[PDB]
């Protein structure tokens, strides 16, 4: 699951590392599957 | 509304007039209502114009409509183009949509983009029902190593 991201999808991703802030920004991220 | 109209002296004159704009439609029953000029009555539902005034009217409507969409953006486009659209969309006596109607066709052949990778079951079936391919499509002629009968290839050169 943690390797793939397919619980049972998109969860779990390779931590961003181009810039220090881009990494912070990645750990602070959110996602919404699928009326406004 | 304003309305350039001819003057008895000849010049066009801005002769303002009262018009009612409606938020709902019932063309059939409003033309009849007395007090209105049943000649100039209009709707932006070309589908209703067609049903009440005939496809030729519908064609004009459909154009008048397509026009406004573009015009409303300040844009302009030559009549010949939208006209052609409006015609294709009409030649069959009724209003035909183009945002893909059929799941198979619109105006193609049994070879262009042989999709489905079933050029297998398609060829078997094409043999069954003696199919006659016109070969006027670019990619069908590709498979024959020919130019399609378009622009540059719409005529033969000879000795």
């Amino acid at each position: 699951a943690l390797a793939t991201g397919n619980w049972g999808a998109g969860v779990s991703q390779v931590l961003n590392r181009y810039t220090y802030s881009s990494t912070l920004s990645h750990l602070r991220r959110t996602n919404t599957p699928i009326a406004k | 509304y304003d309305r350039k109209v001819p003057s008895p002296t000849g010049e066009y004159v801005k002769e303002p007039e009262w018009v009612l704009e409606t938020d709902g439609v019932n063309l059939s029953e409003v033309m009849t209502v007395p007090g209105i000029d049943p000649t100039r009555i209009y709707t932006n539902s070309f589908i209703d114009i067609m049903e009440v005034l005939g496809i030729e009217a519908g064609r004009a409507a459909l154009y008048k409509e397509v026009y406004n969409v573009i015009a409303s953006d300040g844009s302009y486009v030559n009549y010949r183009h939208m006209a052609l659209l409006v015609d294709v969309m009409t030649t069959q006596g009724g209003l035909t949509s183009v945002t893909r109607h059929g799941f198979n066709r619109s105006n193609t052949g049994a070879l262009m983009r042989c999709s489905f990778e079933e050029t297998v079951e398609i060829l078997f079936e094409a043999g069954a029902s003696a199919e006659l391919d016109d070969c006027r499509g670019v990619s069908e002629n590709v498979i024959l190593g020919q130019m399609a009968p378009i622009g540059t290839g719409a005529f033969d050169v000879m000795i």
């Binding site: 961003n16 590392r17 181009y18 810039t19 220090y20 802030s21 881009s22 912070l24 920004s25 602070r28 | -």
Partner: protein, 146 residues
């Protein structure tokens, strides 16, 4: 009496206040916290710049030399920005900056910087302006259940 040069704010018509914001700039996230004067900026532009910060180079860890990962871009000479944010301090931005304080000039010069292209000082590219290191790394193993 009121400094004209300052933005116009409404008032405090309230005697029912239950709470008070620690600070309003705390409504931005990591990305946005790095934008200078995002409040004097058109709405969307801030969303573009938020996305691009991620496409930027610079030190991302003071231990890049000891790490072995598919690609890593380090900026030869990172530089803390002259214009900053009271929020950049917690995002340790001045420590691991991305970016460099370039001496810009807004002008029509040779016609070589239209439709978003820039004219860049060659002589400075030489003295080190914007050079970066690029580190790619491949990897392999041996057989399986054979």
């Amino acid at each position: 009496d009121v400094d004209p040069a300052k933005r116009i704010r409404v008032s405090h018509h309230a005697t029912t206040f239950t709470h008070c914001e620690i600070h309003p700039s705390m409504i931005l996230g990591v990305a946005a916290s790095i934008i200078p004067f995002p409040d004097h900026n058109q709405s969307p532009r801030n969303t573009y710049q938020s996305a691009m910060g991620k496409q930027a180079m610079g030190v991302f860890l003071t231990n890049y030399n000891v790490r072995m990962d598919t690609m890593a871009n380090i900026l030869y000479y990172p530089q803390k920005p002259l214009g900053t944010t009271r929020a950049m301090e917690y995002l340790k931005f001045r420590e691991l900056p991305a970016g460099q304080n370039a001496i810009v000039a807004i002008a029509c010069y040779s016609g070589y910087n239209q439709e978003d292209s820039m004219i860049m000082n060659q002589s400075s590219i030489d003295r080190g302006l914007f050079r970066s290191l690029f580190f790619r790394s491949y990897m392999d193993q041996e057989k399986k259940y054979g």
